[PDB]
Amino acid sequence: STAGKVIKCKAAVLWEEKKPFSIEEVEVAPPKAHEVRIKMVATGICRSDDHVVSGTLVTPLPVIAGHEAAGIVESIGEGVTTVRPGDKVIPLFTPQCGKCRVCKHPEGNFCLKNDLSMPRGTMQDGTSRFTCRGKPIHHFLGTSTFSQYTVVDEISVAKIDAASPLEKVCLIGCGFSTGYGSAVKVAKVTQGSTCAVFGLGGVGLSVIMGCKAAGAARIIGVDINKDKFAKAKEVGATECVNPQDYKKPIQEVLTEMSNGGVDFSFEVIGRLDTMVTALSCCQEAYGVSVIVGVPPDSQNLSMNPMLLLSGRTWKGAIFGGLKSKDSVPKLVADFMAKKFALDPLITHVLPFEKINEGFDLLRSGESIRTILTF
Amino acid sequence: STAGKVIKCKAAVLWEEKKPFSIEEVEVAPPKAHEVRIKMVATGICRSDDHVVSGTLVTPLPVIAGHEAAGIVESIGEGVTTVRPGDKVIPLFTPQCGKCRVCKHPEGNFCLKNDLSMPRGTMQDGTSRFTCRGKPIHHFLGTSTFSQYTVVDEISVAKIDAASPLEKVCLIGCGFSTGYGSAVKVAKVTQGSTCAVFGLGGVGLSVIMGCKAAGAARIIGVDINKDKFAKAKEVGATECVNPQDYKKPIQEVLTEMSNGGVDFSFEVIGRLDTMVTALSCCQEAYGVSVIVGVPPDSQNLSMNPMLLLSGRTWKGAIFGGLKSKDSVPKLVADFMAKKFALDPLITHVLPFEKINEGFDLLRSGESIRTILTF
Ligand SMILES: NC(=O)c1ccc[n+]([C@@H]2O[C@H](COP(=O)([O-])OP(=O)([O-])OC[C@H]3O[C@@H](n4cnc5c(N)[nH+]cnc54)[C@H](O)[C@@H]3O)[C@@H](O)[C@H]2O)c1
Ligand SMILES: NC(=O)c1ccc[n+]([C@@H]2O[C@H](COP(=O)([O-])OP(=O)([O-])OC[C@H]3O[C@@H](n4cnc5c(N)[nH+]cnc54)[C@H](O)[C@@H]3O)[C@@H](O)[C@H]2O)c1
Ligand SMILES: OCc1c(F)c(F)c(F)c(F)c1F
Ligand SMILES: OCc1c(F)c(F)c(F)c(F)c1F
Ligand SMILES: [Zn+2]
Ligand SMILES: [Zn+2]
Ligand SMILES: [Zn+2]
Ligand SMILES: [Zn+2]
């Protein structure tokens, strides 16, 4: 009955930086050609969504944020072939168009159709599907999951198993896949190796899971919030360190602990200083450091390139380096087969209408992932 | 016989920064246990030796520099097993102790016994074998090849083919192996790829050689000195560009030429700016950039980590990533089997006594490699 019609629904609109979300009525246009309209079921609160609020991440406002989610297709536009009404789906904040030089490359994932590098806050066609108070509202990363209904381009959605528990698998849309992939695919963590993980939130925990799955012998968690250590150990950390406890810089501490530097390090926070610290702590001749955290907009880091000349490898990735549309359904299948766990990441559950409380929990340090249910 | 005796011989002593080498008599002590005294036959002038003169590289002075060379063993200390008097050898500025965690690592080559990171300018035992005018003179990288005789630790010397032409294979001691290995081993250049090489001196030409040997389809040379272009093309560059010819930054030019970024880039100059430019010009999702050049002491670069977050890989290496004592004899064997050419690197051959004139040729832009013959 709603196919081809505008849907009025509730969404969490961010009108201004540094302000609460406003849960209010929006109008969601029907899908155009090669677009998919989704009834949201669950969405996680990721720190990158908070970055939009804080201005760490710059994207056009006003906006409907949210990028870690799962739902059910309500309708499809003309020409859509990869999903149908009633399918369970995960929106893909990194698209997979399948046609660009990155999508065709054996390793790359950062499809050239992404709306991350130079955000416009639109659909692929440069327009918006959202109206609120009579005003157009921007999209976020082509996903905009903080709404009872969203519209996404086909290249930004993956069909997943029909029996999937959406209130769990939404985490495959960002935090789990990013961390796990960053360890297994990007870093290529080896059996017997020593890893250091900076930041023990949902993504860092997922990095630890990946390092443990890859066979690391030592996984050293690093966080300034010691309350994060117990869960990090539960998912595989062998030791945890708080930089605030030490007189020496933590790169020196980690070098000492690893008898000359770690094999793999990960920055999973979003600070320039910890990006350089994490590079430094990996072994100077053969270490690898991966940047996962999102730094503040337009700010440069300073480093000595001798850190690299000796032999270190430095890299970053979006979404764990995973080709999104290929990988998401496989990860859901593997979850269903108990190949990895998601429950350790979920510390709180709230209805969507309590989104602001969910952000308060993240900001206070108390939560890992809060899952919002529509 | 000279064995067991102090040798008085000619060497090029650097008494202070930014002055000519002084060609004069030095005393060379006999080798102690696990040391090798070598009669030099040929040594190349590498830009890294000029960095000692210019203060770009800090190492204790006064010093006998030189690190790219070949000669013949005059005598061995107690306990030496890997070379014998009369053997042709190449000194190894990056040692291979075989025992440290780096030597045991499948990939690493920057042996922990090196004298690069924190130079002492001595033998492994913390003493010097050189005196001049009654004063102790420092070693350089455990090699000190700007002397008719030097003494090196066993871990810093490789035996090579007895039939080798030492006036050519001395380049395997630094410039050829560095560039070639940086392409083939460190970057792992792939067949059909597009490469950009910043700096078309001896090392950059060797990077071209390696990119061509790895099957690159396009190899774009970049230099401010257009006189370098003809030789770059002879050894495999498909195109050359001079940044001075353009009104836009060269990373933009290279991104446009490569239809969105190169597969592999190499910084083979030693400037902070060109290191960031080289990284930027590689494709944002899957590009790899390798730092080869040596930058000025204690200077940090500035860069936006979004260049890495999108998926680039940034790395550096010493000596092409090659395990030195394993690799050098194999490279010489490969040269003797006509697997690569060295002649294109050699533009001048001078007696040792003309060392200063050789450095002047380098500084004026007129030479690639000058080989000094003893
Ligand atoms: N690359 C990607 O695709 C991608 C995907 C998802 C998240 N992100 C980013 O990854 C980062 C982590 O996200 P998250 O796990 O949801 O965030 P989070 O739950 O806020 O976790 C960050 C952790 O860092 C800790 N921390 C803060 N400062 C320091 C410090 N100075 N030293 C050590 N620990 C510190 C903090 O206590 C917290 O536990 C954020 O910057 C995200 O924006 C990137
Ligand atoms: N990593 C290693 O193990 C290693 C080994 C050997 C050499 N090096 C370094 O590698 C670098 C090159 O050595 P080399 O080939 O003997 O030196 P070289 O022969 O002086 O060549 C350098 C080239 O860079 C060119 N150049 C200078 N400025 C620019 C610019 N702004 N943009 C483009 N081109 C420019 C210059 O014209 C010259 O052709 C030096 O910094 C060495 O110290 C490192
Ligand atoms: O959490 C994933 C995520 C990122 F990794 C970004 F780089 C980004 F800009 C963003 F908006 C985002 F949501
Ligand atoms: O040319 C090789 C070379 C280097 F790569 C250095 F990093 C260095 F410090 C040095 F002295 C040197 F000779
Ligand atoms: Zn694509
Ligand atoms: Zn996220
Ligand atoms: Zn070693
Ligand atoms: Zn050199």
Side-chain angles (χ1 to χ4, degrees):
Chain A
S1 99
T2 59
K5 302 175 190 167
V6 174
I7 289 173
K8 286 180 172 175
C9 68
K10 298 310 185 288
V13 178
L14 188 72
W15 295 102
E16 199 174 332
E17 277 182 37
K18 301 175 185 178
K19 298 294 181 135
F21 297 93
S22 178
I23 290 279
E24 64 178 289
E25 183 171 273
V26 298
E27 295 175 77
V28 185
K32 300 182 187 224
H34 300 99
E35 299 173 4
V36 177
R37 184 157 66 177
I38 304 169
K39 180 179 173 174
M40 299 318 304
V41 174
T43 189
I45 291 170
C46 175
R47 179 62 69 168
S48 299
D49 298 302
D50 185 66
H51 292 337
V52 173
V53 185
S54 69
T56 291
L57 265 174
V58 173
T59 196
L61 307 175
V63 66
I64 298 173
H67 63 286
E68 182 177 83
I72 296 167
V73 176
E74 168 279 340
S75 68
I76 60 173
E78 309 193 333
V80 168
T81 62
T82 60
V83 303
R84 294 186 285 268
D87 284 345
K88 290 179 171 170
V89 287
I90 288 173
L92 308 176
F93 76 82
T94 303
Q96 185 177 349
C97 78
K99 298 176 177 180
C100 78
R101 202 168 64 174
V102 177
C103 285
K104 294 191 171 270
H105 190 276
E107 304 308 320
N109 79 324
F110 191 54
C111 175
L112 294 162
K113 301 291 203 179
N114 77 82
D115 193 42
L116 277 76
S117 286
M118 297 269 321
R120 299 183 282 173
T122 67
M123 299 291 293
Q124 285 297 322
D125 75 359
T127 69
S128 168
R129 302 278 167 287
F130 298 121
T131 306
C132 185
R133 312 181 184 190
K135 299 168 185 191
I137 311 294
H138 294 98
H139 296 246
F140 179 57
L141 311 179
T143 60
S144 288
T145 73
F146 293 168
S147 182
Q148 288 172 333
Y149 290 82
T150 192
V151 182
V152 305
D153 289 286
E154 185 175 21
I155 60 168
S156 295
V157 64
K159 181 181 175 183
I160 64 164
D161 181 329
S164 302
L166 300 185
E167 82 288 358
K168 313 287 199 186
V169 299
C170 56
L171 294 180
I172 289 165
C174 184
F176 174 80
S177 303
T178 294
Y180 193 85
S182 294
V184 309
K185 184 187 176 38
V186 182
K188 302 178 197 63
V189 169
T190 50
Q191 189 162 0
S193 68
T194 295
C195 297
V197 181
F198 289 77
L200 301 177
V203 184
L205 295 170
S206 300
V207 173
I208 292 169
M209 290 173 178
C211 290
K212 180 172 176 187
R218 292 179 66 183
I219 303 165
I220 305 163
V222 184
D223 203 303
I224 60 171
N225 183 355
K226 67 184 192 298
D227 299 342
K228 300 287 172 178
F229 295 171
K231 179 60 63 62
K233 292 177 160 173
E234 286 172 33
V235 303
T238 54
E239 61 228 282
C240 288
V241 299
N242 179 348
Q244 304 176 336
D245 292 348
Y246 293 86
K247 296 189 193 184
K248 284 168 170 165
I250 202 70
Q251 60 193 50
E252 190 177 356
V253 172
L254 291 166
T255 298
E256 293 167 354
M257 284 176 70
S258 59
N259 298 291
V262 304
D263 300 286
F264 304 95
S265 66
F266 303 83
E267 200 282 5
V268 209
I269 304 162
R271 298 174 59 86
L272 297 179
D273 60 1
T274 46
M275 291 172 191
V276 179
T277 290
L279 175 67
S280 303
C281 82
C282 78
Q283 199 290 324
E284 68 178 355
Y286 56 76
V288 174
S289 187
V290 182
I291 305 178
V292 185
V294 168
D297 180 72
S298 298
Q299 301 192 27
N300 280 15
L301 57 79
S302 173
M303 63 80 72
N304 186 328
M306 288 300 320
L307 293 175
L308 299 171
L309 196 70
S310 48
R312 295 185 181 83
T313 300
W314 204 13
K315 70 202 291 190
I318 299 298
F319 197 60
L322 299 177
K323 290 181 183 287
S324 59
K325 194 158 179 157
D326 298 334
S327 300
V328 163
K330 180 57 166 145
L331 286 167
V332 169
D334 288 345
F335 176 68
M336 296 301 286
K338 301 203 80 185
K339 305 300 191 188
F340 57 84
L342 296 171
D343 290 342
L345 307 178
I346 297 168
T347 57
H348 296 81
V349 292
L350 288 171
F352 175 66
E353 291 73 28
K354 297 177 178 175
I355 184 161
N356 289 310
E357 176 182 352
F359 279 79
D360 294 338
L361 285 168
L362 179 70
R363 297 166 182 146
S364 69
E366 193 188 322
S367 57
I368 297 291
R369 287 295 199 262
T370 296
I371 307 300
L372 298 179
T373 291
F374 291 94
Chain B
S1 68
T2 48
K5 303 179 192 157
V6 174
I7 289 177
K8 288 186 168 163
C9 72
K10 195 177 303 184
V13 177
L14 188 68
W15 291 100
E16 80 183 272
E17 67 161 17
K18 305 192 179 178
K19 298 296 186 173
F21 295 94
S22 182
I23 304 151
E24 63 180 291
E25 182 169 70
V26 303
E27 303 80 48
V28 187
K32 300 192 194 163
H34 296 106
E35 301 176 358
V36 178
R37 186 158 65 178
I38 302 169
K39 187 174 183 174
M40 299 321 304
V41 172
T43 185
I45 296 172
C46 174
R47 178 64 70 168
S48 302
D49 301 301
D50 184 61
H51 293 334
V52 174
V53 183
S54 72
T56 288
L57 265 181
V58 177
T59 195
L61 303 178
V63 71
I64 294 175
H67 63 289
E68 181 177 83
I72 296 166
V73 178
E74 173 269 348
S75 68
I76 62 172
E78 200 181 50
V80 168
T81 59
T82 61
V83 303
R84 298 198 176 84
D87 284 348
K88 289 176 172 179
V89 289
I90 290 173
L92 310 175
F93 78 81
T94 303
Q96 187 176 357
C97 78
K99 298 172 178 197
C100 76
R101 213 164 58 173
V102 179
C103 289
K104 296 182 163 171
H105 191 279
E107 302 303 321
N109 78 319
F110 191 52
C111 170
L112 295 160
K113 298 281 198 190
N114 76 81
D115 198 39
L116 277 75
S117 290
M118 303 256 75
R120 301 184 282 171
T122 62
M123 300 294 293
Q124 286 294 325
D125 79 353
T127 69
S128 168
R129 299 282 164 287
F130 299 121
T131 62
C132 183
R133 323 192 190 167
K135 300 175 216 161
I137 310 293
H138 293 96
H139 298 245
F140 177 57
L141 312 177
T143 59
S144 291
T145 68
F146 293 161
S147 183
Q148 290 175 333
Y149 292 79
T150 189
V151 181
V152 302
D153 293 284
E154 186 177 23
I155 63 165
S156 296
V157 66
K159 182 182 175 186
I160 64 163
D161 190 326
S164 322
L166 298 189
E167 75 285 355
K168 308 192 176 308
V169 301
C170 54
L171 292 183
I172 292 165
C174 182
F176 173 77
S177 305
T178 296
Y180 195 85
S182 293
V184 313
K185 183 195 174 76
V186 178
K188 301 173 205 56
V189 169
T190 54
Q191 194 154 15
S193 64
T194 294
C195 297
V197 182
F198 289 75
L200 307 172
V203 186
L205 294 171
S206 297
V207 170
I208 292 168
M209 291 176 175
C211 291
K212 178 174 181 181
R218 290 181 67 186
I219 303 163
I220 306 164
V222 186
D223 204 299
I224 61 172
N225 181 356
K226 72 182 198 174
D227 297 339
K228 301 291 175 172
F229 293 170
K231 181 59 65 63
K233 289 178 164 175
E234 289 174 26
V235 302
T238 53
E239 299 176 282
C240 289
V241 300
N242 184 345
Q244 299 173 342
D245 291 343
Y246 294 89
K247 299 189 184 177
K248 294 175 157 158
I250 200 70
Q251 61 198 40
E252 298 183 14
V253 171
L254 294 161
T255 300
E256 182 272 346
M257 289 172 67
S258 61
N259 299 291
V262 305
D263 299 288
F264 304 92
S265 68
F266 302 85
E267 199 281 8
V268 205
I269 303 159
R271 299 176 54 91
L272 300 179
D273 55 3
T274 45
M275 291 170 190
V276 178
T277 291
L279 175 66
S280 304
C281 79
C282 79
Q283 203 285 327
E284 63 179 358
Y286 57 74
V288 174
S289 189
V290 180
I291 303 180
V292 186
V294 174
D297 184 76
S298 301
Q299 298 190 209
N300 282 6
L301 58 80
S302 176
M303 62 82 69
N304 185 320
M306 288 304 313
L307 294 176
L308 299 171
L309 202 68
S310 54
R312 293 183 180 82
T313 303
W314 205 11
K315 68 207 290 195
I318 301 299
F319 196 58
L322 305 178
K323 295 181 179 287
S324 60
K325 191 157 181 161
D326 294 330
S327 303
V328 161
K330 293 192 275 177
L331 288 165
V332 169
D334 289 348
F335 175 69
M336 298 299 291
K338 306 172 179 201
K339 300 191 178 180
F340 55 88
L342 294 171
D343 283 357
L345 305 177
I346 298 169
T347 56
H348 295 84
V349 184
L350 302 175
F352 174 63
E353 293 74 22
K354 297 184 187 299
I355 183 164
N356 289 306
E357 294 87 336
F359 276 77
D360 288 342
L361 287 164
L362 181 72
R363 292 170 187 140
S364 68
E366 175 162 358
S367 58
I368 301 294
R369 287 292 202 262
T370 295
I371 306 306
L372 300 176
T373 56
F374 289 89

